């Protein structure tokens, strides 16, 4: 199955420095990695040397891997390499932020699991390759996407010469494997309201021990949802345009419906255009605030990620209303 980098993409990648009007930039929660495409694999790269030193991973591999997720993720409108790595970023901030709760084995595992948790996205929803009638979705029937997702990372980290986590105990590989696994997972947005609900009752009997595994397992969990939607969090001009790359997928999907005879939900629907707005203020307001709210509250120094959210929200207000 599997896509391999060459040598003249992955040496080129060593070659790259970051500029430095942007190390101050990259630190925010709002940062928008949109004009820099450029850079994008070197980002990865800057913010994976801070988070973990620059001797975590031997260069040469780390180029070699980083190259080749790229080399898998699919030319879709939104599910794509560039939402890799958005999400990745936002996932620097927060580690950055919160410089003691994590072990360095989950801020290498966390960082590498963002960049590869939609692996070769095919820019279709679980549901509709369940709905018909997929052969991906006769081998994984429950968190379909995610679990093929987990399934690449799996393979490009035993490719030749990509193995990053190599120099490990084999069974503290057997650990970061498993943390990278639920970090995926935890990103099949169905999961998330179980996962959410939970956390909130926990926290609000005082009974979430950062110490207990599975509550560890479950604010990462959420951690990842939180990155996984951030083109929420940063500055209204900036989602405006993310949100066309939304739109431009589902739309996409429910056209494949429509040429089938059939009704693609309103999200999915193109003659429905001028519903997003307020499918949007639908979307923030009982998946979004939730998130953050949740995040906020479990992790304080994420705030920053809840105020561009509201932010957000009042301008998808401010546009429902015909003032923007
Ligand atoms: C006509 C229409 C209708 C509903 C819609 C909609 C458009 N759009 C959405 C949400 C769309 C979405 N799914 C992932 C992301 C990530 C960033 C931004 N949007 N977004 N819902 C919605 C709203 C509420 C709950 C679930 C979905
Ligand atoms: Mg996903
Ligand atoms: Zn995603």
Redesign the pocket.
Known sequence: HMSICTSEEWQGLMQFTLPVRLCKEIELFHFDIGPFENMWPGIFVYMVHRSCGTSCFELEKLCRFIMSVKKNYRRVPYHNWKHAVTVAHCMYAILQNNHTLFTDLERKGLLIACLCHDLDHRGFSNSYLQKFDHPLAALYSTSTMEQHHFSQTVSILQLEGHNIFSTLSSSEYEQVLEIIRKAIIATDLALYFGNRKQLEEMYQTGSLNLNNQSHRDRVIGLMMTACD?C??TKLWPVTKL??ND?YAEFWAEGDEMKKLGIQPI??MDRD?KD??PQ??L??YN??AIPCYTTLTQILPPTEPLLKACRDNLSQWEKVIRGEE
């Open positions: 939607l083109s929420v993310t949100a939304i309103p999200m429905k519903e997003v499918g949007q639908g979307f009982a998946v």
